Amino acid sequence: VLGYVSDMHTELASISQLVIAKIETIDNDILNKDIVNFIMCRSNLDNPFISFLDTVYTIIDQENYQTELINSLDDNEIIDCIVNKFMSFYKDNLENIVDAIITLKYIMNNPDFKTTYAEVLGSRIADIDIKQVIRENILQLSNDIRERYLG
CB of 100 closer than 8 Å to CB of 86: yes
What's the domain range around 113?
1-151
In the DSSP assignment, the letter for residue 45 is T
What residue type is assigned to position 147 of the chain? E
CB of 102 closer than 8 Å to CB of 56: yes
What resolution does the deposited structure have, in angstroms?
Answer: 1.9
Give CA–CA dist 89/93, Å, rounded.
9
| Experimentally determined by | X-ray
Of the candidates 99, 73, 88, the one whose C-alpha atom is nearest the C-alpha of residue 133 is 88
Full 3-state SS string of 84-135:
HHHHHHHCCCHHHHHHHHHHHHHHHCCHHHHHHHHHHHHHHHCCCCCHHHHH
Give every CB contact of residue 25 below 8 A, 6+ residues apart in sequence: none
